[PDB]
UniProtKB/Swiss-Prot annotation:
Modified residues (Phosphotyrosine): Y353
Protein name: Growth arrest-specific protein 6
Tissue distribution of the protein: Plasma. Isoform 1 and isoform 2 are widely expressed, isoform 1 being expressed at higher levels than isoform 2 in most tissues. Isoform 2 is the predominant form in spleen.
Subcellular compartments: Secreted
GO BP annotation list: activation of protein kinase B activity; animal organ regeneration; apoptotic cell clearance; B cell chemotaxis; blood coagulation; calcium ion transmembrane transport; cell surface receptor signaling pathway; cell-substrate adhesion
Interval of the full protein contained in this chain: 261 to 678 of 678
Positions bound to Ca(2+): D64, E66, R175, D369
Phosphothreonine found at: T334, T350
Annotated source species: Homo sapiens
UniProt effect for mutating F213A: Decreases activation of AXL
Amino acid sequence: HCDGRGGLKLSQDMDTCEDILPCVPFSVAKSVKSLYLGRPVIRLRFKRLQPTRLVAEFDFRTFDPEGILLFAGGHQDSTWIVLALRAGRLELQLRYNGVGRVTSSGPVINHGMWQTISVEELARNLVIKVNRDAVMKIAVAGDLFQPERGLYHLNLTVGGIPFHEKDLVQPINPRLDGCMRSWNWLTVKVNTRMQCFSVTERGSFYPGSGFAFYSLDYMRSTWEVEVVAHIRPAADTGVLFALWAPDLRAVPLSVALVDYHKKQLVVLAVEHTALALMEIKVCDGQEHVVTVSLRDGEATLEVDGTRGQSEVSAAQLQERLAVLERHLRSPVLTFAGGLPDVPVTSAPVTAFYRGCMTLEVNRRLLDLDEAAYKHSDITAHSCPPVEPAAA
Ligand SMILES: [Ca+2]
């Protein structure tokens, strides 16, 4: 037993522990002149003498279906607008003198391609454009700028709002894994961490240093566990999915990549017992579909449609599943990409996963922005591409 959580794995004749190194490199290219909205990322204030109307333009890119791009206006009880995304479509929320309205049009925006977005306040209406084409026009009577002393002021936040989401016209989860560039108001501060991947692909990226967890119920067979994971690994060892029983320091169920049977494998387990193993080309840079389904008297593991062989007898399989039932009988936590500090004998693998991954549990796609907790370095709705060879 080595410490996977520590970046070590058993090597060769099981005489020593070795470092878990990446077998597939992912591009690290960052876009210097860009802003990552993940993790308000920026608050601006425009003290303007002489009446004036709001005008703003910027480039935007994302695969994320929901979130807030920006806010503009004054006090939560005054007049303001919020540009957001819901179900992948642009949404404009407005509040003029306390009165709130909300509209959204057919422009699907979360396609991952850069696009120019513009917002302009005309004495008559508010106009929103996508690539020069007007997509929203709402009649309004009021002003976004507000008189203070002898000047006109206006606050603008990027990537979030100055108040709580519960005070919006329509509630929304603000977290937005998206990128901005070429800002033109009427913020270039070099901090690598604030820059976005130069190129993006679909999925969630796990650098291999943390996890995310949820509180999901698997009761009602009287119970059921179904998982579908689309993965593009960077390393041959790591936890993909797992359940944790806190008061027992146990890991009732886990699905992970393991390089020893020495073979590149995916393992399905209940606590320390491997129920099934299935081969997989974990280092060829390709995407693979791993699926698992368990119910009373049944457990199945598949990799790209092919079922793996059972590692236990029919009798002991029923014994293991019986114990699983007892566990699911009490509240457990669901982990993605890693585990908390648990006994090394608790499960076959405890190392953190490294690579791109999408998870669907009990037929429901998991959105990392909805997790009770998500380690800050995990990108919820984007993954860098595998790095191309020189040629
Ligand atoms: Ca989101």
